[PDB]
Amino acid sequence: VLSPADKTNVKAAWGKVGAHAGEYGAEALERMFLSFPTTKTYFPHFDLSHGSAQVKGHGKKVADALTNAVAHVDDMPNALSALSDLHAHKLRVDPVNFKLLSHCLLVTLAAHLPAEFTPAVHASLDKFLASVSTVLTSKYR
């Protein structure tokens, strides 16, 4: 459950990300594939080498989705409705993996936002990514 403080924190952190959101998306993905190789099982059709355009492209889509989630933080389940359908009925990614990507996004943000990544913001961002994950897996069964 996000508190107003959490929403405030996420909107400030995501705002500083700004136009680099897509870049960070791609880096989080690269960090995930290297740190947790079992996640590559969902991308057999991708070139996963460093600097891959598919990774850069997919990173952009993930980032744009998160930006939309932040804009619609008070009604995420409707805002992400299409994505939750796609993940539940088509992609069918095991829920454990969402934690892995979330961790890698936090690591990425920490590496890019020294001043803004305080313990309070870290906590709000972790809750936020967990809520997004929960929404993306809410229609699995």
Binding site: P37, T38, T39, T41, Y42, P44, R92, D94, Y140, R141
Partner: protein, 146 residues
């Protein structure tokens, strides 16, 4: 895997009463029903849209037999699971692209199935022994992932 000799003996004593054909189909079918996302690997099997379709699907039954036959072979080498499942680990990673989390889910569904099948004979200590076995098999199957 480190099972005690009394744990090993309990595991083998119970397994001798298992019809791997029946149990295999039930275990794989329940996995597909309880955790629907695992169906992603079996679109080639046909209709899996309802519990009745899954449980009655002949390909699900045949595949269950194969899986649990390989599991059964593994019980003869509890001291070297890594070795026994090495080729299968490579196959599941490089060719089939199966997330190893699925092996853990199947392990727990199998434990439920053994409990359903044997009732009171599936005691707490026997369960504990099978939990070690199923974790060990999942770890062995995940060892060659990269």
């Amino acid at each position: 895997v480190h099972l005690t000799p009394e744990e090993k003996s309990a595991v083998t004593a119970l397994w001798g009463k298992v019809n791997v054909d029946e149990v295999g189909g039930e275990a794989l079918g329940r996995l597909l029903v309880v955790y629907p996302w695992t169906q992603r690997f079996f679109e080639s099997f046909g209709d899996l849209s309802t519990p009745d379709a899954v449980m009655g699907n002949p390909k699900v039954k045949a595949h269950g037999k194969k899986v649990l036959g390989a599991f059964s072979d593994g019980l003869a080498h509890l001291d070297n699971l890594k070795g026994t499942f090495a080729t299968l680990s490579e196959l599941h990673c490089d060719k089939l692209h199966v997330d190893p989390e699925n092996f853990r889910l199947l392990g727990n569904v199998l434990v439920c199935v053994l409990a359903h099948h044997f009732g009171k004979e599936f005691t707490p200590p026997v369960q504990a022994a099978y939990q070690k076995v199923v974790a060990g098999v999942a770890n062995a199957l995940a060892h060659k992932y990269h």
